[PDB]
Paper text:
S-layer proteins (SLPs) are self-assembling, crystalline proteins coating the cell surfaces of many prokaryotes. We determined the atomic resolution structures of all functional domains (I-III from N- to C-termini) present in the three S-layer proteins SlpA_ac, SlpX_ac, and SlpA_amy. The Lactobacillus S-layers are anchored to the cell wall through interaction with teichoic acids (TA), either lipoteichoic acid (LTA) or wall teichoic acid (WTA).
The SlpA protein (~46 kDa) is the main structural component of Lactobacillus acidophilus ATCC 4356 S-layer, built of two domains. The N-terminal part, exhibiting the first two domains (SlpA_I and SlpA_II), is known to be responsible for the self-assembly of the S-layer protein into a regular lattice. One basic tile is composed of the homodimer of the full-length SlpA, dimerized at the SlpA_II domain. The assembly is propagated in one direction by alternating SlpA_I dimers and SlpA_II dimers and in the other by the pore spanning N terminus of SlpA_I. The self-assembly region (SA) is formed by domains SlpA_I and SlpA_II, building a 2D crystalline network that forms the exposed surface of the SlpA layer.
Residue numbers in the entry: 199 to 291, 298 to 307
The structure:
């Protein structure tokens, strides 16, 4: 099956969590959320005795999570973050819920 893993430790992860900084007006860019998630977690499938990486839908998943919280993102990626929200990151042959906190 597809599973998610920690990039740095290699451990299998079921639920993830990251922190992303806002600017002094409480604005965040989706690109910084995508970087926080994808730098920390990756998806892969075992085959041919190795882990094979699988592309995650992180940007789309972030925008979908914010739209479920009634938060819009503008054409160049900025939005007003909630304090914390959950992104359901998907990779295809698995879903990794990732808690995103914006202090």
């Amino acid at each position: 099956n597809v599973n998610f893993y920690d990039v740095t430790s290699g451990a299998t992860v079921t639920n993830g969590a990251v922190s992303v900084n806002a600017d002094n007006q409480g604005q965040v860019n989706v690109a910084n959320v995508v970087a926080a998630i994808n730098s920390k977690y990756f998806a892969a499938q075992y085959a041919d005795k190795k882990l094979n990486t699988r592309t995650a839908n992180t940007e789309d998943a972030i925008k979908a999570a914010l739209k479920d919280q009634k938060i819009d993102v503008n054409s160049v990626g900025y939005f007003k973050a909630p304090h914390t929200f959950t992104v359901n990151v998907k990779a295809t042959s698995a879903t990794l819920p990732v808690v995103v906190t914006v202090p």
